[PDB]
């Protein structure tokens, strides 16, 4: 994917990671996001609890700065 200026997303729906490059999120988790892979809806990539990876972009919401 592509790097972007670091931003924070709050998870809205649960997602369970399966591959190395995915992360698990639960509603309310805050992810520090620095990557995207464009798609419909595509993927966002970032760090949560010491792990890094993709999660589906429509499963979280951008937190205003
Ligand atoms: Cl797609
Ligand atoms: Zn493995
Ligand atoms: Zn992959």
Swiss-Prot record:
Tissue: Isoform 1 is expressed almost exclusively in the brain. Isoform 2 is detected in brain, spleen, lung, liver, heart, skeletal muscle and kidney. Isoform 5 is primarily expressed in brain, spleen, lung and kidney (at protein level). Isoform 1 and isoform 2 are detected in brain. Isoform 2 is ubiquitous in adult and fetal tissues with high expression in skeletal muscle, heart, spleen, ovary, testis and all fetal tissues tested and low expression in thymus, blood, lung, liver and pancreas. Isoform 1 is expressed almost exclusively in the brain, in all brain regions.
Domain SH3: start-end pairs: 5-65
Location within or outside the cell: Endomembrane system; Synapse, Synaptosome; Cell projection, Lamellipodium; Cell membrane
Domain of life of the source: Eukaryota
Subunit record text: Interacts (via DH domain) with CDC42. Interacts (via SH3 domain 1) with WASL. Interacts with dynamin, SNAP25 and SNAP23. Interacts with clathrin-associated proteins and other components of the endocytic machinery, such as SPIN90, EPS15, EPN1, EPN2, STON2, FCHO1, FCHO2 and DAB2. Interacts (via SH3 domains) with REPS1 and SGIP1. Interacts with ARHGAP31. Interacts with ADAM15. Interacts with PRRT2. Interacts (via SH3 domain 4) with FCHSD2 (via SH3 domain 2). Interacts (via SH3 domain 1) with DENND2B. Interacts (via SH3 domains) with CBL. Isoform 2: Interacts with CBL and DNM1. (Microbial infection) Interacts with vaccinia virus protein A36.
Function: Adapter protein that provides a link between the endocytic membrane traffic and the actin assembly machinery. Acts as a guanine nucleotide exchange factor (GEF) for CDC42, and thereby stimulates actin nucleation mediated by WASL and the ARP2/3 complex. Plays a role in the assembly and maturation of clathrin-coated vesicles. Recruits FCHSD2 to clathrin-coated pits. Involved in endocytosis of activated EGFR, and probably also other growth factor receptors.
Domain notes: SH3-3, SH3-4 and SH3-5, but not SH3-1 and SH3-2 domains, bind to dynamin. SH3-1 and SH3-4 bind to ARHGAP31. The KLERQ domain binds to SNAP-25 and SNAP-23.
Protein known as: Intersectin-1
Organism: Homo sapiens
